[PDB]
Amino acid sequence: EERNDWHFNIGAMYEIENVEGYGEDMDGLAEPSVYFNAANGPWRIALAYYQEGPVDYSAGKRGTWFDRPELEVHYQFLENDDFSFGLTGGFRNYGYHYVDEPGKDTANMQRWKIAPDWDVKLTDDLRFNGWLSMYKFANDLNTTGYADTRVETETGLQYTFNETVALRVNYYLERGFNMDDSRNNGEFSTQEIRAYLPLTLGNHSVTPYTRIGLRWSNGEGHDFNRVGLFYGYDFQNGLSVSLEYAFEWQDHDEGDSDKFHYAGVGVNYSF
């Protein structure tokens, strides 16, 4: 059926950028990103573009730029009030440029995203959800050393705490395997727990992120629960601003050229 609604969603994202800074002998790099979402009934399109606009200072010879086009296809299947259905898609492609030794030095690879949506209502205060992200398209002749074609599993549950306070959990599962190789335990299986609690209150959106630690790696790395933070402010409802803040890993190093913070800023709008 052709559902009627018509809705658009456009947002952006930047890190630091030439706006707020303090230093007369150092600088960083800003990576501006864009997002374009189109809502048309059961069919929901979503795409995102990347870019880079750092400060030039005569690095090598020429400046070679590179972009990464991303697409997505959302589809609603539905079935019952308790259990729902859906279909999600994605398109990833990266271009390779080698201006060091000309001679038809160029590769070609793609990435198909396929992750359906599953919903299961067990109670009025218990919302279950799960979806497996599969990636298949390119063979990766050089990237074969790690991965290229494999299936992933990422579930997500929602538990309502209060009328103006909710909770959300997520279980990440990594997977790896070659197209065809005589192995017994070559496949990799990693697990990462990540949860966030959505807090809706007036014109202020704050969804803290929880991350457990002290359950992996020899040395120390993870600590405390609240490591992430999701901000949200809409001075006009439609237009809002989201900010991602983290506090994981230890900051014990020095430099004078490279530097990356643990925060993020972005915008969102609807037509």
Curated annotation (Swiss-Prot):
Protein keywords: Cell outer membrane, Ion transport, Membrane, Porin, Signal, Transmembrane, Transmembrane beta strand, Transport
Keyword Ion transport belongs to the record: yes
Top-rank taxon, per record: Bacteria
GO CC terms of this entry: cell outer membrane; pore complex
Keyword Cytoplasm: no
Membrane topology field: Multi-pass membrane protein
Transmembrane segments: 6-14, 26-36, 43-51, 68-77, 83-91, 108-115, 128-137, 151-161, 165-174, 180-188, 192-201, 209-216, 224-235, 239-249, 259-270
Gene3D superfamilies noted in UniProt: monomeric porin ompg
Localization (cell): Cell outer membrane
Biological process terms in GO annotation: carbohydrate transmembrane transport; monoatomic ion transport
Gene Ontology molecular function terms on file: maltose transporting porin activity; oligosaccharide transporting porin activity; porin activity
Function text: Forms channels functionally larger than those of classical porins. May act as a regulator of the RCS-phosphorelay signal transduction pathway.
Quaternary state and interactors: Monomer.
Protein name stated in the entry: Outer membrane porin G
Species annotation: Escherichia coli (strain K12)
Phylogenetic lineage: Bacteria, Pseudomonadati, Pseudomonadota, Gammaproteobacteria, Enterobacterales
